[PDB]
């Protein structure tokens, strides 16, 4: 049941953790003692199954009947037995080369006193170096055994508990009805769900415990349990199903319980139900969506070129802000770790990008602007600033993705790679001309050459100096600053501008197959172009790589080896579901597509159509409107059709269980012939009947 | 004159259109409600209503009796434009479907040439699909051919007549006198063929009615292009590709950019659905108009001006069109008029019995000797009991005694 | 109505669909940003409802004119046009109330079995002086001669009588007969 | 016509209904943000 | 040609640096030496 | 032939790219000149006869 919000008598779409439809799960059986007698077990301590968003256990079921004892050959009444789980984060091997050992802290769930109390202790299980117990060279398995009348005292024999956090005890009333138990881990902890909340009158599960376990459990196993007593009693089998992140369409009843759901990707009819958000449907031809077209792969290629010269940022002297230097990097692969390892970044300001995505991602160029500037005046580089820095020294161009990195270099690293700052540092505090107005600086431009030459010429601070330059006199001003921290470190400012385009995208991150993923929805990352799509091999300019469409949709890819790949969106083939309400049968129309294409994309279809199309062939007919699956050709002609398929084409519902593919026939009127003679033939009735037309 | 009675039935994959199969976008779309289910139900509703409208229209067009050999067995009336000759379409239907710039989508294997090698080819990348029509192109043409073969039934209270005899009975009830038709049979057929040839040679950019057939196709194409053109718009985001937004930007700002893409796609889909509803209303009105036009003009003769074409109606032919039905109305257009005078009704001086003109006027030939002519053609003739009736005497009736017509003597 | 009512719960990208929760949780600068994106969704819903009501008013006006035509052509009098007033050939129609409109019950004349026959445009003697034509029917023949008259919607051979055959002009395609001529033509 | 003409004075959440005042009062990023919500209102008016 | 994005068979509304229609520009012509010395140029 | 200065440098355009089959111009060079150019002049020259 979805925690957080309670619904009642409605029908909505959920996106929680649910098992997929018709999942058989894993079945586990518990045995008795023989007929001294010995435990009987089923190799259950060797499997460390993955957690994978938790699981769900069908505790009980298959009860109240005459079962079979596992030992010998005998029959007895089956009773409900509670499984004991064992959940941990890291696995390993026992010192017998036999798997099933959980290192570090281990959540252990196991019932007490013939299943009337549930104990969930979470701590480390150290093996006990004895004979035939865990931790020796001679070891088969650990068995949790208990008579008829505590399980933890049987756990003390095999394992030795140490440094143990908590032990939660929960009370459960003994019964024989089928019970649902589920486990799920979130940021708050390991939630526990059971069907015994709010009375016990449904199979829905509500949260009853939240154990604090803040590292993720990745594995779980089952204690092999045997109960000391052939034809005495029998124990039920519990089934464990995995939880997947997927969508159901659920329907709540009047007391707000889930009475029916619909796995969206299971059938074609459930794709219809999930696409229209309705359970009870009317007969007709519909339009369904894909609820099983999630990506199942990955592909990444990029051009491999020489390393960009990012080492020029850490040589010569640190530039002044009045005379900063710019470098543009093209047609090379860049490694930004060479920039970010020698500096101590403590401020970044980015737009249209992030520093996490500046390291990856392919651009068309890489413009880097750097100068020395103290951190105390880092607000003068902020957007909208009215200081003298932003109008005469450096105006940032915000039309492109940028990252302004305020970083510092300590004296040890800077002295190692000869980064020095000993000359005077200054900025243009005034750039007026002969006329009394300041010369403002355009976005993304170097300082004005008339003011910059004069400011770099002087060596002392002055506010209204009269410079000459060449011709007209410019009245300039110079103000000094110290970029070096009194500890010894130097403070820098790096502005990195990234230019994206639809072209070749040559500059790519530096790093140290597609034929196996053909026909499936995959995540492709080709030359900085990301998206989703299936890939085929079509016939082939093999230098522009991405052939486009008039709507700028990518329709094909030219590989580097020479082959031409044929991409399409994962949801591209239109699907119509022919549903008949009386027969409760469904059929599928793949409109306007020839029927060779469906056989080579079975992964993106529904979960039942994939298994029908992967096991042998046949069942697919080529009509005038597409390729139908679930039909059969009947060569029957009809005059009216309640499920019109297309171009004068019917669909007779069944009464195997396949729809009949009929055609519409034109009922000819009563043909009369014209006259050459004077006499003209006529058609007169001789019998009538009243008919009504409302 | 052309009437457009069919909308373009399309189905849009809402989830693929809005979010392109990205789970982050699909997570953000669920806070806008149940948009995709509502849009799917609206498109399915308008498609179901269009199918029902087509079924009802063709059930109204269907005629219980027809003569398939009438259009070929005729006199000098060159009726080969509507003659059924593979392809079951007539000459005019083929001319209409060939002269229009209509790109018919491949219904049987069109995906094999749209990809693996254009609004018929952009539906597989933009996530919509133009649904195939309810009836085949041949089956619609058999309905039109049966209607054309059933035109020459008996106008009075079925019965099969030649085309020449039928247009004779139509022009007799027009007002043209009995004796004019027998003397101008050849001239009438030669005048009919000239008008049909002029309509045949006028299929250019000069007639407005065929331009309406082109504007219907252009309207459908513009609607589909407007639907498909919002996949490239950014709507203020960094790019129109959701994957590029997911790669370039952090978690907090991806919501803002993906939401401003989502709002644009929602606006586009809602505008398309509202346009489909308005076009469905127009199609319903035009379907009722086509029903009335067929049942009145094609199956009878009009007594009302303007309806069934300008002039005065004689015969009408209905053929199929790319988006609706095409009507060819043949009218009676007189050219030269003669001024005359007549009377409400003539009779003798005793006023015992008085008569009135039937389907014409009592013209005067000289100072006396009143004659009768048709109401649409000039042909004086003696007054006969089959072109006049006995009516009540009136104070405005003419009094004559020198020459009495045989009804009056 | 469901579309109008169920879009109050849509957050439209905000943190919540409740104005009070947004006012409590957020500062006065982000409150404007979140309340505005709720407001845009509400305005879009109201404008969509108003436009839909306008289109439905258009449909209601067209259907009201249609119902007026149906009543005055079907219910108060029988109709001479096919297809209208129900399929078949109209005889009588009944109009009753419906939830959102009106319900019409059209009763039609539907023939079942047909008999082929031959008839004539007119019927007169060898003198071709006066000729007659059938009224609401055709001049059928039962053999070599003795032309008779039947109804146009039911087969019943009846003798030709002056109330079911009017006198018309002679025509060149009319039959000539002098053996068993009907009393109108004798 | 009044609905067409009177929705040019609505700010739709922006600081002003005049583009020139927005360009005078804000930096580049907020100019891009605030002009777009005026643009959406004008597009909605024209489409309506 | 607009760099950064290619197009193929489509009418699009562009924006950029283009010369205005029916502009004559400035015409420059080169020569040889005046008549093999004394080269002949303009200013 | 065409020239254009951007924030990434001075671009150079010519119509000889892509086989020289049209009058459209495509970028073939990007000189690293980050000083914004204000003026241009035409250098006179004369080839020998
Ligand atoms: C981008 O630049 C960074 C920094 O220059 C590269 O990281 C460097 O990677 C090398 C390769 O593994 C590391 O060398 C290793 O050194 C240890 C001893 O220090 C040695 O035992 C290993 O066998 C190996 O040689 C190096 O330490 C590491 N430097 C830093 C600062 O992380 C990075 O590899 C570059 N990117 C690419 C794609 O090459
Ligand atoms: N010792 C012992 N333990 C058990 O748990 C046990 N369980 C059974 C239960 N046997 C059966 C037999 C048939 C189906 C069966 O037909 N199930 C359907 C699903 C439909 C349904 O029953 O609800 C199936 O899919 O197989 C199930 C359990 C029998 N002997 C036992 N013996
Ligand atoms: C997981 O278990 C390992 C041992 O299997 C722990 O490693 C020990 O840590 C203690 C405390 O720091 C040391 O005194 C031991 O020498 C370590 N032994 C080994 C073999 O590494 C490890 O600390 C545990 N993990 C956590 C998070 O506690
Ligand atoms: C086995 O039998 C017991 C009783 O004979 C079943 O328990 C009942 O289950 C129904 C099902 O809803 C409840 O309404 C009753 O209240 C239960 N009675 C008791 C005393 O608990 C049990 O469900 C049966 N097991 C199976 C698997 O059907
Ligand atoms: C201002 O910066 C520029 C470049 O950042 C300096 O120009 C360099 O000068 C050195 C030696 O003078 C040359 O070797 C380089 O080739 C020059 N590079 C460029 C791009 O011109 C310039 O010297 C700096 N001004 C001052 C006063 O130091
Ligand atoms: C639950 O919904 C059904 C229709 O689905 C309705 O008939 C019934 O009254 C509802 N229950 C309550 C308590 O309102
Ligand atoms: C376990 O494996 C190790 C090496 O893999 C081997 O030396 C040892 O004998 C094995 N022990 C057993 C009980 O198999
Ligand atoms: C167990 O003890 C024996 C001897 O007492 C020793 O040889 C062996 O290594 C021990 N094993 C472990 C896992 O401590
Ligand atoms: C069962 O009882 C016997 C003695 O009654 C005892 O030896 C044995 O350990 C018990 N089994 C357990 C506790 O699992
Ligand atoms: C569980 O049961 C025991 C004994 O019946 C009792 O002492 C304890 O308080 C119970 N705990 C809860 C949570 O009900
Ligand atoms: C620089 O390196 C020297 C030698 O390792 C060390 O003594 C000094 O502390 C380092 N500088 C800083 C700031 O830690
Ligand atoms: C720094 O300069 C000195 C001066 O000679 C030189 O010896 C040394 O190699 C330089 N170091 C680097 C990293 O360039
Ligand atoms: C590619 O061309 C060859 C040559 O005729 C043809 O046989 C093959 O079917 C083509 N493949 C595709 C995918 O078009
Ligand atoms: C069904 O069979 C008939 C006759 O056998 C044939 O004409 C028709 O093409 C077939 N339809 C399909 C889809 O194969
Ligand atoms: C008319 O047809 C109906 C049904 O075929 C039949 O029951 C009835 O007897 C017929 N009447 C005559 C007079 O043939
Ligand atoms: C009818 O017209 C067509 C072309 O309009 C011509 O080819 C044909 O010969 C004509 N037929 C007669 C009988 O004149
Ligand atoms: C014809 O005579 C009658 C009776 O004498 C008279 O009422 C009527 O006005 C006369 N008509 C004309 C046109 O004079
Ligand atoms: C009847 O006789 C008239 C005059 O003799 C002739 O014109 C007409 O064609 C005849 N009718 C038939 C059907 O022969
Ligand atoms: C676009 O391409 C098609 C096929 O390549 C061509 O026929 C057409 O002339 C081109 N231009 C336009 C405007 O459609």
Residue numbers in the entry:
A (entry chain C): 50 to 84, 90 to 203, 211 to 290, 294 to 576, 583 to 610, 613 to 727, 733 to 771
B (entry chain A): 772 to 856, 864 to 895, 902 to 941, 947 to 1198
C (entry chain C): 1013 to 1198
D (entry chain B): 1013 to 1060
E (entry chain A): 50 to 84, 90 to 97
F (entry chain A): 242 to 290
Question: What are the paper's exact sentences on this?
Answer:
Merbecoviruses from bats, pangolins, and hedgehogs pose significant zoonotic threats, with a limited understanding of receptor binding by their spike (S) proteins. Spike (S) protein is the major viral surface glycoprotein of MERS-CoV and forms homotrimers. For the MERS-CoV S-trimer, NTD is known to mediate cell adsorption by binding sialic acid, while RBD is known to bind the human dipeptidyl peptidase 4 (hDPP4) as the entry receptor. The S2 subunit mediates membrane fusion and exhibits a higher level of sequence conservation among CoVs.
Notably, the S-trimer of CN-HedgehogCoV was identified to adopt both locked-1 and locked-2 conformations. Although the locked-2 S-trimers of CN-HedgehogCoV and SA-BatCoV are similar in overall S conformation, no fatty acid was identified bound in the RBDs of the locked-2 CN-HedgehogCoV S-trimer (right). A clockwise rotation of the S1 domains was observed during the transition from the locked-1 to locked-2 conformation. This change in S-trimer quaternary structure appears to primarily originate from the structural changes in Domain C and Domain D, which affect interactions between protomers. However, such interactions between Domain C and the NTD are absent in the CN-HedgehogCoV locked-2 S trimer. In addition, the interactions between Domain D and S2 of the adjacent protomer are altered: In the locked-1 S-trimer, Domain D residue Y354CN interacts with S2 residues D784CN and K913CN, while in the locked-2 S-trimer, Domain D residue Y354CN interacts with S2 residue K786CN. Despite structural changes, the interaction between Domain D residue S353CN and S2 residue D784CN is maintained in both the locked-1 and locked-2 structures. In the locked-1 CN-HedgehogCoV S-trimer, no density was observed for residues 677 to 690, suggesting that these residues form a flexible loop. The same region refolds and rigidifies in the locked-2 conformation. In the locked-1 structure, the hydrophobic core is centered around F355CN, whereas in the locked-2 structure, it is centered around Y354CN, resulting in structural changes in Domain C. A similar reorientation of Domain C/D junction hydrophobic residues was observed for SARS-CoV and SARS-CoV-2 S-trimers transitioning from locked-1 to locked-2 conformation.
